[PDB]
Amino acid sequence: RTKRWEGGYERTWEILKEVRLGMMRHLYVVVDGSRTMEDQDLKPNRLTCTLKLLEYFVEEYFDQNPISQIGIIVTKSKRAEKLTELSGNPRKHITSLKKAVDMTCHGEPSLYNSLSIAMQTLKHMPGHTSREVLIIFSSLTTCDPSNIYDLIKTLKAAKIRVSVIGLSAEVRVCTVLARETGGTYHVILDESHYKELLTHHVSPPPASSSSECSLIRMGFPQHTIASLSDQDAKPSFSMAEPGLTLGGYFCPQCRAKYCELPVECKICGLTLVSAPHLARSYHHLFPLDAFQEIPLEEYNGERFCYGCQGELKDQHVYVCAVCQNVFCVDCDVFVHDSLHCCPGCIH
Amino acid sequence: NVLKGVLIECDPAMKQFLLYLDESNALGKKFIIQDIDDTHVFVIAELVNVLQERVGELMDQNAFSLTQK
Amino acid sequence: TKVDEYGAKDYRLQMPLKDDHTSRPLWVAPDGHIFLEAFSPVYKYAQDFLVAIAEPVCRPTHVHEYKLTAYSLYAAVSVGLQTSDITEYLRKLSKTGVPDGIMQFIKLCTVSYGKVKLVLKHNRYFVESCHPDVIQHLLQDPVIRECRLRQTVSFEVKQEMIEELQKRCIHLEYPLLAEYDFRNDSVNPDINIDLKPTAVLRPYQEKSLRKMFGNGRARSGVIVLPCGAGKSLVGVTAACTVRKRCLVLGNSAVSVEQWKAQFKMWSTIDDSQICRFTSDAKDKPIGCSVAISTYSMLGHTTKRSWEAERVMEWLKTQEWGLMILDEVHTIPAKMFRRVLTIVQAHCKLGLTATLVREDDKIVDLNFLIGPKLYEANWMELQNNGYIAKVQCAEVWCPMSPEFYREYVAIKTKKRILLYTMNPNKFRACQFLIKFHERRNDKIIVFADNVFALKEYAIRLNKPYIYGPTSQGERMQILQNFKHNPKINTIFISKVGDTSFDLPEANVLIQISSHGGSRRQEAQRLGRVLRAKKGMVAEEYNAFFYSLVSQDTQEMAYSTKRQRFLVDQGYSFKVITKLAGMEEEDLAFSTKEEQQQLLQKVLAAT
Ligand SMILES: [Zn+2]
Ligand SMILES: [Zn+2]
Ligand SMILES: [Zn+2]
């Protein structure tokens, strides 16, 4: 047996050559606090990446569904702890996330305890509200005190929509949990896939044939202020060390003044909300019809794009199905993504 | 009395060297008018140029001559 | 030859700029200097190629610098590279072509190889050349005929004159080939030693060995590897490769012990098969094949002991397949170089962590042993984690006024002591020690002058180590320092940097040095280069501080001394003051304390 050096020098350089939608929804975000969260699985630290993107998702969740509320649970060392109960305040959740960036990130998570803690909370929720859970699964191993299939059957019976997002893992329990409950299980392909998946989850869940509709009693109070510079005022503190309130909303039953809306009654257990918050969801009820593509110029004499009055620099163009106005890809994307209405159809 | 001249302030190491220079008569003249302070002395205005030159020389005496080495 | 209005040498009249110079990352200067864009896409290939054909000068982060030399060109031919091969690839890499002055220079150095070869047989040394006529002109000087003893033609040469002849052969433009065909050698019996699979070989180690073993014949020369880079393993691996009787020589008995442990640790060889020919210890060297000794023993100029003479005569008569020389920077010494004439060795391999010395004898290694077979890029090893990231620093300790007053007054050697001992340097070390001690960092203090070493260590109530300290006391202190949590620093004299196996430490403070010498500086730094139990290269866990007295000769020596480290790429961050030293309780807080020490310092007489 001769050594590798008998052949010669390496000469490395020689290689070179010359549907119905559930409007109101209650969702709990489940996040692993397990050892794998400290792993630099993506470019940034997975814990930092997931928390940073969750702050965006939390804000967008309320931004697309004001009447909704969100909750967050952290699960580590076989335990599951409710980081923040269901609430309408993204800033409170986001504040907890910024704090959670320094979490111990030690131990093994428990899906069973995470789901059961959520179910013990979501079981008392009303029937009209869409009960949901979002699971950010990081470490494919998860300890459980009992057979998860019973809990899954209980989740179906409890009508709690569960959807799992697996990071670098395609787990069996998550597969069956999602598809049996009717939810979806997805895995992070890349940062864009993660951003896309959370963005997709912001959409209200499509109503299942097993889902039933219900009415809900709701309160629409009016903000009230002192008459003029601390005159005829009504001194009071906010219900949210609460400071004094110069002006704020009320409740016909609570008669307690509030600084921030929409919120659930702290007393009556009834939702208080302003009329624009409801209209913020009506785009779900008025889905915008897609504009037909005309990437070629197709002899369209309108050199300027109707939406942006700019000459179309590329072979990508769209025309409306009703008003027949012409819009460039940036206008069509912005219209379908942000405006949700056809400018010409408004006429 | 009152005395003409120039004041110079520097760290006490240089201040000692300055005192040493006339104490040793390196420049041959008692250019220090008086001991003002641990970092301050008053000196004759005409000798400040060779004094500054001797300080410059002292650095080269205590510094490596890079000279493209 | 050509200089612009500015001091820079210009070469517009010497070489053009190629059409795709932006893609080509290299320049070739007519004076032999070479530059390489370290950030270029082909840097990897260019680095290997330039390490193969040139001598590295500087290897900083963005642009490396190399220069061509006959020895480096011989090494290129030693790996089979033809003049056309190096020229063609150099031209391809060069964004400004190849200057004809260098091309013709390369021609001469390339054709001046393979012509003459030196070989030894039956304890006799023969100079062979393929061409028969070359001998007639090469012998035209009587120095060769007096050196000569009273195809492939050859003649025998007087052993004692081989050194003189070999040095002449270089300036005579006919270097002697030293390839040893240990594979096709039945005259010298092979030894039953192999590298046990426990040994792990790193890429740089493998590269250096592959370059040394360019073919089935071992090439003589010097390998430069840091102590932390496992130079010992390369030596052991080379012996396991040669499989023939080999002689290892260390600069100290401690090194001889280290080599024995390393051979047992890495090779299948048994303890009885290894002998440590030393005056202090005996293993019946004649009883085994592998021998280990020191230059002081074999190079000994005075009368040998009768018993040691027995082994030495046996050593003299036996032929050594491989001769491993450790810390060869000492080899050019008048006595140490004699060892090369005393011992008969087929191939000689030199190893050292600091191939630098203040005398102009370092270049003798090219003819005494051979060209640089390899030289590790210390920054690359840090980037690869093989070496600890050391955040070197230079603390500019301001000298005290009453000290400067005397320092400037006293021009004799006594000023070395006064610049070495002052309250600010003292307080700075005490502060850095306290800080790193309370930081739970192992600290090694280094000094030269024993007077300052003692007065510092006693005032700091810490154990010092120096020459007359017996080996038992010396090692007992190291064991306490390593294991006892209540001790975290040791004050070592030159004994620690000259030659030793000191336990690795996170921090090192050098309060005194022999001078602006590069060798001792890199030897001292070598002690902290060892990777720790759980460090990472980006952690900057290792530290190295040089304490210098401002406005003193120490400044000159320190900057002069750092030359080799800055050339390797280390950044000597200057520290003018340390925050907290103003409030931390430290010695010499009052002028009377300073006066008392100064008085005793003056008492040194
Ligand atoms: Zn109410
Ligand atoms: Zn447009
Ligand atoms: Zn439209």
CATH code (residue B28): 3.30.70.1220
Is A19 in a helix, a strand, or coil? coil
Contacts of C81 (CB under 8 A, 6+ apart): C52, C53
CA–CA min distance B36, chain C (Å): 15
| Residues from chain A contacting residue C216 (CB–CB below 8 Å) | 6
| Residues from chain C contacting residue A3 (CB–CB below 8 Å) | 213, 241
Residue in chain A lying closest to C237 (CA) = A3
- Judged by 3 or more CB pairs under 8 A, whether A touches B is no
| Residues from chain B contacting residue C561 (CB–CB below 8 Å) | none
Which of C209, C269, C257 lies closest to C233 in space, CA to CA? C209
> Is B68 within the bounds of a domain?
no
Residue B11 main-chain phi, psi, to 5 deg? -60, 155
Is A30 in a helix, a strand, or coil? strand
Ligand number, closest to the Cα atom of A253: 1
Residue in chain B lying closest to C558 (CA) = B64
CB distance C109 to C70 below 8 Å: yes
Instruction: Determine contact: A1 vs chain C, CB below 8 A.
Output: no
Which of C562, C563, C446 lies closest to C498 in space, CA to CA? C446
CB distance A22 to A72 below 8 Å: no
Burial class (CB in 10 A: 0-12, 13-18, 19+), C136: exposed
Residue found under tokens 């940062």: A191
Instruction: Determine contact: A17 vs chain C, CB below 8 A.
Output: no
CB distance A30 to A117 below 8 Å: no
Is A162 in a helix, a strand, or coil? strand
Q: Is C353 annotated as a binding residue?
A: no
CB distance A164 to A178 below 8 Å: yes
Ligand number, closest to the Cα atom of A307: 2
CB distance C421 to C511 below 8 Å: no
A12 vs C48, C213, C241: nearest CB:
C48
CB distance C424 to C589 below 8 Å: no
CB distance C195 to A5 below 8 Å: no
- Kindly list the strands in the beta sheet with A263-264, ordered across the sheet, starting from the edge strand earlier in the chain: A218-219, A271-272, A263-264
CB distance C416 to C443 below 8 Å: no
Q: How many CB atoms lie within 10 A of CB A284?
A: 15
Give per-residue burial for C511-534: e unless 16+ CB within 10 Å, then b: bbbbbbbbbbbbbbbbbbbbbeee
Concatenating the DSSP letter of every residue in A81-102 gives: EEEEEEES-HHHHHHHHHHHTT
| Residues from chain C contacting residue B14 (CB–CB below 8 Å) | 551
CA–CA min distance A38, chain C (Å): 17
Q: What are residue C445's DSSP bridge partners?
A: C491, C509
As a three-state string, the secondary structure of C226-264 is: CHHHCHHHHHHHHHHHHCECEEEEECCHHHHHHHHHHHH
Residue found under tokens 């192992």: C442
Q: Which residues of C touch B (CB under 8 A)?
A: 398-402, 404-405, 408-409, 516, 550-553, 555-556, 559-560, 563
Angle between helices A172-181 and A148-157 (to 10 degrees): 20
Structure tokens at C507: 């921090």
CB distance C452 to C421 below 8 Å: yes
CA dihedral C482, C484, C487, C491 (to 10 degrees): -40
Domain that holds residue B28: 2-63
Distance C286 CA to ligand 2 centre (A): 94
CA–CA min distance B64, chain C (Å): 4
Ligand number, closest to the Cα atom of A308: 2
Q: Do A16 and C92 touch (CB under 8 A)?
A: yes
Burial class (CB in 10 A: 0-12, 13-18, 19+), A28: buried
User: Judging by DSSP bridges, how do beta strands C319-326 and C246-250 pair with one another?
Assistant: parallel
Rounded-to-5 percentages of helix, strand, coil across chain B = 40, 20, 40
> Is B69 within the bounds of a domain?
no
Concatenating the DSSP letter of every residue in A221-238 gives: ---B--SSSSSS----B-
Give kind and range of the element (H or E) at residue C206.
helix C203-212
Give per-residue burial for C461-493: e unless 16+ CB within 10 Å, then b: ebbbbbeebeeeebeebbeebeeeeeebbbbbb
Residue ranges with strand state E in chain B: 6-9, 32-37, 40-43
**Radius of gyration (C-alpha) of chain B in whole angstroms:** 13
Q: Largest Cα–Cα distance in chain B? A: 54
Structure tokens at A293: 């593509």
Which of C367, C503, C500, C361 lies closest to C444 in space, CA to CA? C503
Structure tokens at B19: 């005192």
First to last CA, chain C: 54
The CA distance from C347 to C220, in Å, is 5
What is the number of residues in chain B? 69
C-alpha A222: how far from chain center: 29
The CA distance from C57 to C251, in Å, is 27
C-alpha C283: how far from chain center: 30
Structure tokens at C462: 């810490």
Q: Do B62 and C399 touch (CB under 8 A)?
A: no
What is the number of residues in chain A? 347
The CA distance from C406 to C419, in Å, is 10
CA dihedral A226, A230, A233, A235 (to 10 degrees): 120
Could you give the count of Cα atoms lying within 13 Å of C181 in the half-sphere of its Cβ? 9
Q: Do A5 and C213 touch (CB under 8 A)?
A: yes
Tell me which residues have their CB within 5 A of the ion that is ligand 2.
A 305, 307-308, 328, 331
Is C324 in a helix, a strand, or coil? strand
The CA distance from C77 to C311, in Å, is 39
A5 vs C44, C45, C209: nearest CB:
C209
| Residues from chain B contacting residue C553 (CB–CB below 8 Å) | 62
The CA distance from C496 to C444, in Å, is 10
> Is B17 within the bounds of a domain?
yes
CA–CA min distance C551, chain B (Å): 6
> Is B45 within the bounds of a domain?
yes
Q: Do C405 and B14 touch (CB under 8 A)?
A: no
C551 vs B13, B24, B64: nearest CB:
B13
Q: Is the peptide bond before A262 cis (omega within 30 degrees of 0)?
A: yes
What's the total number of domains in chain B?
Answer: 1
Give per-residue burial for C547-579: e unless 16+ CB within 10 Å, then b: bbbbbbbbbbbbbbbbbbbebbbbebeebeeee
Give kind and range of the element (H or E) at residue C157.
strand C153-157
Instruction: Determine contact: A9 vs chain C, CB below 8 A.
Output: yes
Contacts of A among chains (3+ CB pairs under 8 A): C
Rounded-to-5 percentages of helix, strand, coil across chain A = 30, 20, 50
Q: How many CB atoms lie within 10 A of CB A23?
A: 20
User: Judging by DSSP bridges, how do beta strands C63-67 and C33-37 pair with one another?
Assistant: antiparallel
The CA distance from C431 to C50, in Å, is 45
B62 vs C402, C516, C552: nearest CB:
C552
Ligand number, closest to the Cα atom of A249: 1
The CA distance from A10 to C240, in Å, is 21
Ligand number, closest to the Cα atom of A322: 3
Residue in chain C lying closest to B59 (CA) = C551
This entry's atomic model was obtained through cryo-EM
Q: Which residues of B touch C (CB under 8 A)?
A: 11-17, 19-20, 24, 38, 58-59, 62-64, 69
Structure tokens at B60: 């080269």
